[PDB]
Structure formats: C-alpha cells, structure tokens
C-alpha cells in the first residue's frame, strides 16, 4: 500500500505520533516521504547484507529479524515481515522505541538530510478538508 500525503498524516495522528517526544506530525510525514515515499511495502538491501523494511525503512541489523543478517540484533523483537503491511501499527511501535533514544529522529538519514531544519509543517498543511 502507498499512502497519499494527507491520508498518512491522519493515520500517524491516529497512531499517536503527533508530538511524540517533541516531534510534531509534519516531521513523521516528511520522514516517511523521503525514507520510503509513503510505501508500506518498500524494502532496501544495504551493502552490509542488512535490509531496511517498511514505510520508515527500519534496519534489520538492530531492530527486527529477517534471519538473513549475521550478528543481527532484534531490539524491537519482531520478524521484519511485520513491518511490511498496509497497517502501520508495528512500524509505528518500533519507530517510537527508536526515536526514544538520545539521537531522536537523527536515526533516519533521510530525515536528517531532507527534513531537519525545514518547514516540516508544510507536509500536513492543507489536510483534513
């Protein structure tokens, strides 16, 4: 499934992301845009054998298990497959844990390069009617 800008804004708000740990909704929508382009099915194989899964490209080396990664950690304690569904619940739950680290949303390279320091509020402006 691929979300529209406003549709995802609404789903993330409903999933308690708006202002979670100091990050307004526009940050999460922007992060999703540049990480997976709103695709819940997106997956990218990294150069070290690990793979990013889901709408927020969550890495299999430290957050989930796909059984295809060497000395892999599974901090979110889930099969990487659970991050690939039209229902973002698992993706959001793991993203909340991830952003609870001291690094915040810096964990996401795309967010650091395309969202941080910009008018992220623009991503949700003009939604809900």
């Amino acid at each position, epitope marked *: 499934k691929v979300f529209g800008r406003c549709e995802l804004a609404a789903a993330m708000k*409903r999933h*308690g992301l708006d202002n*979670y740990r100091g990050y307004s909704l526009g940050n999460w929508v922007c992060a999703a845009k540049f990480e997976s382009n709103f695709n819940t099915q997106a997956t990218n194989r990294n150069t070290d054998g690990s793979t990013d899964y889901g709408i927020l490209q969550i890495n299999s080396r430290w957050w989930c298990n796909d059984g295809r990664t060497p000395g892999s*950690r599974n*901090l979110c*304690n889930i099969p990487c497959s659970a991050l690939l569904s039209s229902d973002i619940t698992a993706s959001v*739950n793991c993203a909340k844990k991830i952003v*609870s*680290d*001291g690094n915040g949303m810096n964990a996401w390279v795309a967010w650091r390069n395309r969202c941080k320091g910009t008018d992220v509020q623009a991503w949700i402006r003009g939604c809900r009617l």
Partner: antibody
Amino acid sequence: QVQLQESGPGLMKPSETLSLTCSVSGDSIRSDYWSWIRKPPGKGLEYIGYVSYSGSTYYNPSLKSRVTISVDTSKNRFSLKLNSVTAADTAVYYCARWDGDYWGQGILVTVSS
Amino acid sequence: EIVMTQSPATLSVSPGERATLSCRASQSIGNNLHWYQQKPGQAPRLLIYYASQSISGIPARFSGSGSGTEFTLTISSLQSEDFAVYYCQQSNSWPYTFGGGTKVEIK
C-alpha cells in the same frame, strides 16, 4: 524468555549513595533499552529513568540529578546509582526492559532516618 | 511534567461485575498510554499498551480505549485474580509518569 534479577542493600544511612544492579539472563544487554522504576511507601509508581541503544540516558528531573544509569556489556548487567539518599528514597526498586515486558523481582531499600 | 489522574482511588466491585477505570492526562498524549496491574508482593505486569493494543497471555476481559487526554480500562467479568492495583503510564513525554493508581477491591 528473559530473566532479570535485582541485587543491592536493604538498609543504608542518609547522604550515602544507593547502588543497585540488575543481572540479565537469557538475553543480551546488547544495545537494548533498560529502565529503573520505584514505588515509594504509600505512593504510586515513579519512573527513575532509562538508558537506550546509543548509550544516552534519560533521568527523571524530580531526582535532582542524583541518578546515574550505566550498562555493563562485559558482565551483561545494568546499574543504578542514587546519590545523597534520604528517608524520601525509601521504596521497592524494580528493573525492567523499556518495553515494559520484562521485570525484576523488585528489591526493597530502606533509608532508615 | 505530564500529570496523570486515575479515578477512582479505590474502586469497589463484586465478582463477575464490570469495572471501568478512568485515566486522564493533563496534556494530549495521542495513544501513548499503557496500563499496568500490580498484585501484592509482585512486580507490575503490562496489560494494555498504546491505549488499546492487547497482549497475548492476558484475559480477554481486559480492554482499553480512548485518546488525547481521556482513557478507559474496562474489565468485563471481575474475577478473584483481577483484584489488585492498576496504573496507567504515559510515554509521550519525558519524564514518563504514572497515575496515582487504582486499587480494585472486592465488594
């Protein structure tokens, strides 16, 4: 399947430092998140703080910067250090994985004063 | 910090009856509210996370709902093993905070 076990003192004088450790078996202290919670006598639950993957630590401000939390990857355990204790810090301390899924037996610490 | 208000302090109910615990937050916390159950002598146990997400191994009679600042934990058929103290906790902002707790006892 993860087992947590608190260890420390039961009684100690004020102005001293309270030190607790939580040994984790069946799982690796790896780069996971660990927390400390306590329940004061006749009060509810209070969150002490936690340490995450990067090593960054978050401490409840109400504890006036007296707390320190660290991870011992060699001996697979994490700790809690509370300076300048007083009667107010008397409680049952619990260690737990940040996700709230796993908890220790809990240990009673009394600062008789 | 965000203040969590649990109501009532002591809920008295008879076995088999339904029970509703309320938790309010002084700030909007999305769905970042979790419920804990603590029986005497034991450590707290997670029952419901993120306001309504159920946990495998937990009786079906436990369910939560709500969002923003209003949350509710409903217990269908109160049983003997359901008698204990219940706490709500928000993870929306640091420091994380717990409500004062709600002691569910037999009537």
